[PDB]
Ligand binder design. Structure first.
Ligand SMILES: CCC/C(=N/OCc1ccc(-c2ccc(F)cc2)cc1)[C@@H]1C(=O)CC(C)(C)[C@H](C#N)C1=O
Ligand SMILES: CCC/C(=N/OCc1ccc(-c2ccc(F)cc2)cc1)[C@@H]1C(=O)CC(C)(C)[C@H](C#N)C1=O
Lengths: 366, 366
């Protein structure tokens, strides 16, 4: 195995493939990148066993085929530390990989490419393309609502649901929920999968700002995304995800509208004086006005009053303020609508001007 | 106690008096800031007992004298979270402090200002003034060479020395040394003090880019710096410090000169393949050449060769590359000079074009 490539054709591919990978991944070969030369292409692969990232770079200079595995971080640091415009010559020599540029020479130890972890071939069942921007939307809008290390492994992930001509994401906690759907201009079978925590991260990470569309393929136990010359594959989470349709409030006929930024700053200042563990705030809704109060064990107290649009009956409702701020932070819009039923029922929050996404939050007893 | 102040007049002083790496209190009252209104000025004071930071803010609106102490981080978060241009009215009310602006109200818990730790009055013995830029130069030039938790506790600080019309800093950890002197245009007594690590941190963080000069006063056991309406005071470290003059190599009659950036990048690449704990690299110097090699336990190896200016005898010398890189990063010059004696003696490194700062590093046996 040999190749010579310009440093700058190596930088992004390298950064993109080291994104997976554990902490001494306890499996040391997981700290290595699999390098493969075949045809006129160098392929770079990283994996953490659950997912795998692959980049292709075209070889215009003379090359010889073969494969090896090298420590990912060190090979990246070498390449990155060389001067702009450096030509990097790489050759596999016995149990070492030799890198030379200019009058700099480096030998890295290798692990055999035969030993590198290989996700099994699988069959795609649903395939679609969509703008990168739309995947970013769908992820941003819901990520913050996934569980973290919940016993219910499937809540630690994000549901991806194809339905009609839309792709939808759904994330929940057991306490708060987010869902977002976006039209994609393709007629799709109905299909639901759960993408793990690390895999949604990696998906997001692949997105770059350019005109490369995202090409997706889903199988029974895998998802794959291809943008440009990178391809990301993840295992799926095997469990049944709750139905968002069952979670959305049934009869939320009391509707409050308010400026997003004023609401979020009023909640953010109150939070300062809410209990650091439980974060409870109390909302008093009355004609055209909202009052937010917070208190803590030290007996400290905040109160915020703002003008809002509200015609229904007066009610008092407690919320974990972090749940509320998370939603208001992800909405990024002029005005917000909160849809309320009673003091004992969940509330729905969305952009006053869009039904793309919906957030549901369980009130707190208090 | 009562005052009304514009928010943007509180923001900077608040930030300056809340002095970082003390996130974990000790005594509770230490987590509070001391507010005092007297003679038309609000004074705000933070302390960890070893040091104290005081800001004064002129009060043009009606105000009423008195003092209290409030949770530092909460009062800051409250003021910062209010809207641009907010007027903040504060009044002390029982065992609570009432903060109100617009239609936001807050009540914070207090502890008696009578209880707040006082640092005792002490008398200055040396006083001088000097530009912030020159204090910044002095600290950045040497700070990185301070010890961390060495048993020889005086090494964990920085020496500030007045001599002639210069102020000098020195820092050393027993393995490497930095010294920097800058002229200050005042004739001063010869005097030496050790500033503790946290005090040098606070001295640096009070430098703002402005041309409020530092007014410095040193007593037997304390240092004080006054910049604008901010006054910082620290205990001194009571011990005797190594004489740098001792440590400077006897006479190093082999001089190597090289471009700083080319040298630092060759060392930075090599270090990748050095031992992660001991970080040894070898230097072979030869007519107009330097060769740097590194290896690690897995038997990986880096070589760098570059052109330099060098006429003396060939030599091999081993160094901890992190020490060497620290120096090259702190010198921010075009060319550097290394001053060598033999394989078992320390090297001195400086700007080839300036003698302002000197760095001494002891060789390692590889
Ligand atoms: C064996 C699977 C058990 C289930 N697991 O779902 C976990 C789960 C439960 C509740 C929420 C939730 C989210 C937001 C909210 F405002 C109120 C509740 C989110 C997730 C069911 C479920 O699938 C239907 C359900 C209506 C979500 C039901 C409730 N409540 C359940 O507990
Ligand atoms: C009781 C005094 C303890 C001492 N403490 O100093 C600790 C100390 C020792 C060595 C260094 C040092 C710094 C740079 C270097 F290249 C080589 C050595 C820096 C500090 C003495 C000292 O003050 C004079 C001395 C020549 C630095 C001597 C040595 N070597 C000492 O050990």
């Amino acid at each position: 195995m040999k190749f010579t490539v310009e440093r700058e054709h190596l930088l992004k591919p390298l950064q993109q493939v080291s994104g997976p990978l554990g902490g001494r991944p306890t499996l040391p070969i997981l700290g290595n990148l699999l390098l493969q030369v075949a045809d006129g292409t160098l392929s770079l692969t990283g994996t953490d066993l659950e997912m795998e990232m692959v980049a292709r770079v075209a070889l215009v200079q003379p090359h010889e085929p073969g494969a090896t595995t090298v420590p990912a971080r060190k090979f990246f640091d070498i390449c990155r530390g060389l001067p702009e415009g450096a030509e990097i010559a790489v050759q596999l020599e016995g149990e070492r990989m030799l890198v030379r540029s200019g009058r700099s020479r480096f030998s890295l130890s290798t692990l055999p490419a035969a030993d590198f972890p290989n996700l099994d071939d699988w069959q795609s069942e649903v395939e679609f393309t969509l703008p990168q921007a739309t995947m970013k939307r769908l992820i941003e809008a819901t990520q913050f609502s996934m569980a973290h290390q919940d016993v219910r492994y499937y809540l630690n992930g994000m549901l991806f649901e194809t339905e009609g001509e839309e792709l939808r994401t759904v994330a929940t906690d057991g306490h708060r929920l987010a869902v977002c759907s976006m039209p994609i201009g393709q007629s799709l079978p109905s299909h639901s999968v759960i993408v793990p925590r690390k895999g949604v991260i990696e998906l997001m990470r692949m997105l770059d700002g350019g005109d490369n569309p995202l090409r997706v393929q889903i199988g029974s136990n895998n998802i794959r995304a291809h943008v440009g010359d990178f391809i990301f594959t993840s295992k799926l989470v095997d469990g049944r995800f709750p139905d968002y349709r069952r979670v959305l409030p049934k009869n939320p006929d009391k509707h409050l509208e308010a400026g997003c930024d004023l609401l979020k700053q009023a909640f953010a200042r109150a939070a300062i004086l809410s209990n650091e563990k439980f974060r409870g705030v109390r909302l008093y809704v009355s004609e055209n006005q909202l009052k937010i109060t917070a208190n803590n064990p030290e007996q400290e107290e905040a109160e915020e009053i703002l003008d809002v649009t509200y015609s229904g009956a007066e009610m008092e409702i407690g919320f974990n303020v972090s749940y509320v701020l998370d939603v208001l932070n992800a909405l990024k819009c002029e005005n917000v609508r909160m849809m309320l039923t009673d003091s004992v029922s969940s509330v729905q929050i969305e952009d006053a001007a869009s039904q793309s996404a919906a957030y549901v939050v369980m009130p707190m007893r208090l």
